Design a protein around this ligand. Sequence first.
Ligand SMILES: NC(=O)c1ccc[n+]([C@@H]2O[C@H](COP(=O)([O-])OP(=O)(O)OC[C@H]3O[C@@H](n4cnc5c(N)ncnc54)[C@H](O)[C@@H]3O)[C@@H](O)[C@H]2O)c1
Ligand SMILES: NC(=O)c1ccc[n+]([C@@H]2O[C@H](COP(=O)([O-])OP(=O)(O)OC[C@H]3O[C@@H](n4cnc5c(N)ncnc54)[C@H](O)[C@@H]3O)[C@@H](O)[C@H]2O)c1
Ligand SMILES: NC(=O)c1ccc[n+]([C@@H]2O[C@H](COP(=O)([O-])OP(=O)(O)OC[C@H]3O[C@@H](n4cnc5c(N)ncnc54)[C@H](O)[C@@H]3O)[C@@H](O)[C@H]2O)c1
Ligand SMILES: NC(=O)c1ccc[n+]([C@@H]2O[C@H](COP(=O)([O-])OP(=O)(O)OC[C@H]3O[C@@H](n4cnc5c(N)ncnc54)[C@H](O)[C@@H]3O)[C@@H](O)[C@H]2O)c1
Ligand SMILES: O=C(c1cccc(-c2cccc(O)c2F)n1)c1ccc(F)c(O)c1O
Ligand SMILES: O=C(c1cccc(-c2cccc(O)c2F)n1)c1ccc(F)c(O)c1O
Ligand SMILES: O=C(c1cccc(-c2cccc(O)c2F)n1)c1ccc(F)c(O)c1O
Ligand SMILES: O=C(c1cccc(-c2cccc(O)c2F)n1)c1ccc(F)c(O)c1O
Ligand SMILES: OC[C@H]1O[C@@H](O)[C@H](O)[C@@H](O)[C@@H]1O
Ligand SMILES: OC[C@H]1O[C@@H](O)[C@H](O)[C@@H](O)[C@@H]1O
Ligand SMILES: OC[C@H]1O[C@@H](O)[C@H](O)[C@@H](O)[C@@H]1O
Ligand SMILES: OC[C@H]1O[C@@H](O)[C@H](O)[C@@H](O)[C@@H]1O
Ligand code: NA
Ligand code: NA
Ligand code: NA
Ligand code: NA
Lengths: 254, 254, 254, 254
Amino acid sequence: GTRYAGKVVVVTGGGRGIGAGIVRAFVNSGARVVICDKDESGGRALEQELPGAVFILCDVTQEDDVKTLVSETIRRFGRLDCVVNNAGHHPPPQRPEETSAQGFRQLLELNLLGTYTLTKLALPYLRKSQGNVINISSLVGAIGQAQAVPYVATKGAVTAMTKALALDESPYGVRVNCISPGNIWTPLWEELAALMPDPRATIREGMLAQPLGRMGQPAEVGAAAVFLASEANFCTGIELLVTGGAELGYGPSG
Amino acid sequence: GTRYAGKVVVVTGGGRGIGAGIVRAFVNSGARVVICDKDESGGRALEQELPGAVFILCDVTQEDDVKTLVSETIRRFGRLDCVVNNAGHHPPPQRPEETSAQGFRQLLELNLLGTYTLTKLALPYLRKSQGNVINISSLVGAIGQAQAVPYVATKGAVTAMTKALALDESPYGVRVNCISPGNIWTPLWEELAALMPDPRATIREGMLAQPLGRMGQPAEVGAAAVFLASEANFCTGIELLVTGGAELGYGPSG
Amino acid sequence: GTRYAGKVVVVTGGGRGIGAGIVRAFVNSGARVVICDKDESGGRALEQELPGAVFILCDVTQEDDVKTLVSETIRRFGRLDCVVNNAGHHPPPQRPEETSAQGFRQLLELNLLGTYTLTKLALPYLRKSQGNVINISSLVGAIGQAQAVPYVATKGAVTAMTKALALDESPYGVRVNCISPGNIWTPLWEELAALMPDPRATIREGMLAQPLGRMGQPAEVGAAAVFLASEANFCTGIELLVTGGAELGYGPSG
Amino acid sequence: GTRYAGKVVVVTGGGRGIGAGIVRAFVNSGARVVICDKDESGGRALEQELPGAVFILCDVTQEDDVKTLVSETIRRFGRLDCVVNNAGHHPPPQRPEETSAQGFRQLLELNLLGTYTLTKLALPYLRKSQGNVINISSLVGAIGQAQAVPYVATKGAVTAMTKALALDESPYGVRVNCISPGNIWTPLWEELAALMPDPRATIREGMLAQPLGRMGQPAEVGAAAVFLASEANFCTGIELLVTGGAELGYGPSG
Ligand SMILES: NC(=O)c1ccc[n+]([C@@H]2O[C@H](COP(=O)([O-])OP(=O)(O)OC[C@H]3O[C@@H](n4cnc5c(N)ncnc54)[C@H](O)[C@@H]3O)[C@@H](O)[C@H]2O)c1
Ligand SMILES: NC(=O)c1ccc[n+]([C@@H]2O[C@H](COP(=O)([O-])OP(=O)(O)OC[C@H]3O[C@@H](n4cnc5c(N)ncnc54)[C@H](O)[C@@H]3O)[C@@H](O)[C@H]2O)c1
Ligand SMILES: NC(=O)c1ccc[n+]([C@@H]2O[C@H](COP(=O)([O-])OP(=O)(O)OC[C@H]3O[C@@H](n4cnc5c(N)ncnc54)[C@H](O)[C@@H]3O)[C@@H](O)[C@H]2O)c1
Ligand SMILES: NC(=O)c1ccc[n+]([C@@H]2O[C@H](COP(=O)([O-])OP(=O)(O)OC[C@H]3O[C@@H](n4cnc5c(N)ncnc54)[C@H](O)[C@@H]3O)[C@@H](O)[C@H]2O)c1
Ligand SMILES: O=C(c1cccc(-c2cccc(O)c2F)n1)c1ccc(F)c(O)c1O
Ligand SMILES: O=C(c1cccc(-c2cccc(O)c2F)n1)c1ccc(F)c(O)c1O
Ligand SMILES: O=C(c1cccc(-c2cccc(O)c2F)n1)c1ccc(F)c(O)c1O
Ligand SMILES: O=C(c1cccc(-c2cccc(O)c2F)n1)c1ccc(F)c(O)c1O
Ligand SMILES: OC[C@H]1O[C@@H](O)[C@H](O)[C@@H](O)[C@@H]1O
Ligand SMILES: OC[C@H]1O[C@@H](O)[C@H](O)[C@@H](O)[C@@H]1O
Ligand SMILES: OC[C@H]1O[C@@H](O)[C@H](O)[C@@H](O)[C@@H]1O
Ligand SMILES: OC[C@H]1O[C@@H](O)[C@H](O)[C@@H](O)[C@@H]1O
Ligand code: NA
Ligand code: NA
Ligand code: NA
Ligand code: NA
């Protein structure tokens, strides 16, 4: 691929799931990719698998990890063109009264502030390259979800922050966009389902939540990311839905 | 007024600005109102001014303050029908690189987690009354704003959280809605403008940002809140825009 | 009621259903109301029932009917403060290939162009009164609906037109807003359900389509309309959802 | 290019402007393209210019033209994979009172019903190919525009219809999406500007309406269309904004 040849991309949480699909999509486009993850297992194997991808251990909640991530990317590859802020977590379903302020703070640290910190540290280099930022938010930031008040709040924050930053960075030619996936079949989805009374029914429900009748694939989120980075030069501040139509349509007066 | 007679309302940050307008609108509707504020000056005078309103000193970032707020409301008035989460702050304009993770955390503590904490502590009583929650978010959570990445992020979070909570509380008959004001003429607006090079021009700009050619009034946000509490029984999870049309419309190819 | 005392309101399709609930809500607010309908049965009885409401036979697809509607309102009441464009129809479920361009044109004539024609003829008088326009659109204009391509298209048109007109009329102090109801229990809903294989199941489905677990009432749409007319002086171009939360939330990868 | 190799695409209004950019983007992707236009000049030259593109004279408001368009595409190329409904018109700025029902009907015939008619006639073949529909709507369908009530209404209709059709066609594996461009520099934009008092100032205004400080290019809309057709397999019913950020942000209380 040559769509994004000569470009350098950082993907956080790139060791499995959506992040690994984004990594593969950018390598297939011709980019060199830095896989950031807090766990070694997936990302290290991915680094061996993909020429053009390398792994850097980095917990995005730790500012000194992220500092080193950016400085190592520049030291090893000489430029930085795109940051994909994919690292994030969905906790198990939790009723509002079962949440805590402290759990909510910790989820904000990962899903919101880690995106903020890498974006901030990368922006000097993105300005030099007229690069771009892609945040991985969620459909449920826009429409809500049951038993997930903290998660929904963090993704509403990411989507809004994307628009604010797009405004601030547009004078410098740096675009900032997000992708809001719906149900994507990943190890997180599989882990959440395994906690449920009937996991198999939970998965069947997840498939049928989309008009297309299936869940999405990491590769489909990856193609959207490559589009935003490489071919969407007049897109900034957009929310690209990759949801299979879940937000469409519906799903005595007393 | 009798639209909300016999009802008990808590308004956070009710001592001035939008919150004071909401307090007045609910008193005028027949409700008893608890004015929560971290500063005594405005709220204490408002308590003397309005029969049916009382003042409780309470910093919504301090969980034990909020606990006492709820327990004192119930001890003094016997019920709780509506919580208006209005307390919040807009920092001065800040370029992204001039923000800090720590400032962002502190703003999340006020604009997002204080709303969360009062809502959580109030929900047992709102369930008993089939009451409702009204969060004061912002238009810029939805469309973005320049030089305000942390603020925009917090309001995107509030709007999303409103939808998530509406889903969770609908089985219990508790509605959860938000109001997204645009430019409202308040002491915060006046303070921000006074920091600018030309404050008078900043204010003229703010007026003309709306098709209606003026800024909004606290009383107009108050009327929207009374509508949501007292007459919107089939509304839950909505974002009620009180913006004068700022989001409408627009404001060689190389 | 005195919220809209001394004001004159026209409600199209006011003879039953949502329109009749809007008529009642405005009479209860103190307004004088002109009930426009193409059928006499409901509107005539409503005129006898409600002091302050009168009935004018008028098919909103017939420009000379609408001309006479406006001129008779002014001749009999001396002013015009608010037009509620409620007349509209939802055809039975139709697969896309079972629709016709001609059916689509006819539905546009009612749901879109009749709203346009009355608004146009009323605007000279609304300018004199600094009055306002309320269009009754639909949630499915925003999120879509199955087997309803023409209907969804007409309501997407109404919602967009509302925003365009708000922009054009804001310099004249005339606000233009819409209400997007979800499932409201009306004679139209009952008629559509009666065409289905199991009407009772269709109705049960409609109730459970909302997190609140019931359909809405005409009176709830009416209260929203009175709010927009009488108390939303800083709202223009908004889409007020009266849906019970139907748009919230959701309802292996191959 | 091989992204859309072996595929057959129809682009309406493909003879100039956005449509010509879409035609070029699909040819560059490896597709064979049928250029539909009501005028011969541009499309005929484009057919001579591009191997893999051919021109068919067709007025999308004339059902027998569109019938022949589809039957000639199938007769000459054996399949149909994607329909891009780009033909449309923006009239000169018109105050609401300067519009007519008849002008509005004529604009609906082009911008809305021509899209409907080609989509309907193409869907049997798109089902066989698991193809897709791309409608070219407009940002102003979503946020409004001054002096353009009919145009805004038609584009609100197109965007809503896109979602309705996505729902209906998802069981058949046919995706239906739209693109909502903002200011794109085209012959239509140039013609509208030339009618203004100061055309040069109108163009400068149009450039600065976007945070990116320029208008968009047909090629950028084309890349978005190729993305939707060839790589967005989990996207249906979406509205892809290609606006340069015009919808972001903003642009005493009496
Ligand atoms: N799977 C879905 O249906 C879905 C839907 C919408 C949005 N999303 C979002 O997509 C993103 C990825 O989701 P997923 O399903 O692939 O999840 P996942 O759990 O399968 O993978 C997440 C990856 O991020 C890594 N990670 C977690 N915390 C990290 C940290 N502090 N620093 C660095 N890396 C860290 C994990 O180790 C893992 O490799 C998340 O932001 C999630 O909110 C997921
Ligand atoms: N003014 C606008 O244009 C505007 C626009 C959109 C949204 N808003 C939102 O409306 C709300 C009120 O804004 P405003 O303009 O009236 O502001 P303001 O500064 O005039 O008033 C805010 C009030 O909240 C109180 N408060 C602050 N921190 C508190 C805390 N920790 N605990 C309790 N009370 C606290 C303040 O003491 C003050 O009385 C905020 O949430 C703001 O984000 C304002
Ligand atoms: N019922 C719902 O769930 C629902 C949901 C969303 C939006 N809506 C909208 O609300 C409006 C009213 O719906 P409803 O359920 O009350 O319908 P309804 O069929 O019960 O009542 C419609 C009324 O309008 C009148 N009318 C129809 N054509 C007319 C014409 N040409 N001129 C004048 N009057 C005419 C009818 O005679 C009738 O009295 C419509 O615009 C509909 O699209 C309805
Ligand atoms: N230019 C912009 O800024 C802009 C912005 C948003 C959306 N759009 C939309 O993009 C589309 C194309 O716009 P443009 O600026 O390229 O316009 P344009 O006028 O430059 O080109 C339109 C093309 O469509 C053809 N056409 C018109 N009527 C037709 C008919 N009945 N049958 C067949 N072909 C017909 C014209 O002959 C022409 O070749 C339109 O739907 C327009 O609403 C344009
Ligand atoms: O990971 C999931 C997922 C995976 C499996 C189950 C769930 C889930 C479903 C309902 C409620 C609830 O509280 C849930 F967490 N959610 C997910 C699902 C959708 C989505 F938009 C996301 O951003 C997600 O992260
Ligand atoms: O308080 C303000 C305000 C008041 C005065 C000026 C500003 C402001 C304007 C532009 C950028 C910027 O960063 C700004 F902070 N904002 C405000 C303005 C709009 C709005 F929607 C809000 O929620 C607000 O809090
Ligand atoms: O009138 C109805 C209604 C009433 C009864 C059934 C239906 C309906 C449901 C599914 C698909 C379908 O094509 C349908 F028409 N719709 C209605 C339902 C929801 C809504 F938002 C509207 O605007 C409506 O008019
Ligand atoms: O073609 C234009 C255009 C090109 C040149 C000027 C204008 C225009 C600007 C303001 C009001 C007004 O009534 C206008 F028509 N509009 C255009 C501009 C933006 C847009 F979203 C569209 O869909 C468009 O078609
Ligand atoms: O675990 C669920 C799925 O996760 C995805 O990220 C992987 O690409 C799949 O191989 C796996 O089936
Ligand atoms: O300070 C700006 C404005 O703040 C509002 O909250 C008050 O109601 C006004 O009296 C004041 O002019
Ligand atoms: O027919 C269904 C319902 O229609 C509503 O408009 C009426 O207010 C109800 O009395 C009736 O039950
Ligand atoms: O006329 C304005 C512009 O129209 C676009 O469609 C063409 O690609 C340009 O060559 C031209 O400058
Ligand atoms: Na490697
Ligand atoms: Na008092
Ligand atoms: Na009467
Ligand atoms: Na050719």
